[PDB]
């Protein structure tokens, strides 16, 4: 019985307008950190995740259909589900230099 902090969308949701900022926040966290922000996209998102210590920006969705991490599957109108899947799934299946996952909430919230 453990109440994960990911259950909340604010734990990692930084909103929009935080590219070098959300990246400046990741610079220091531990490998596996991740944050979901937005941008001038048409409504897509970008999850700034720390990989091997070097934070990078990735995309979560591309075409209006859901919030997967690269491929459109199932539905769900929220990222909390996507982030939850990759939260335990490796992200190397696409890159052998990734092997990262959303295991650490960029802003976390295990305090108050």
């Amino acid at each position: 019985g453990s109440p994960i902090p990911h259950h909340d969308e604010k734990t990692w949701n930084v909103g929009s307008s935080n590219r070098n900022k959300a990246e400046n926040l990741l610079r220091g966290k531990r490998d596996g950190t991740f944050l979901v922000r937005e941008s001038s996209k048409q409504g897509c998102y970008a999850c700034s995740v720390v990989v091997d210590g070097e934070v990078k920006h990735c995309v979560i969705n591309k075409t209006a259909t859901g919030y997967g991490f690269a491929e459109p599957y199932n539905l769900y109108s929220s990222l909390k589900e996507l982030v939850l899947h990759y939260q335990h799934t490796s992200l190397v299946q696409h890159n052998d230099s990734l092997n990262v996952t959303l295991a650490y909430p960029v802003y976390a919230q295990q305090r108050r």
Binding site: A46, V51, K56, H57, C58, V59, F69, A70, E71, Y86, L91, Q93, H94, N95, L98
Partner: peptide
């Protein structure tokens, strides 16, 4: 922007 699976 890195491509994921």
């Amino acid at each position: 922007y890195v491509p994921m699976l």
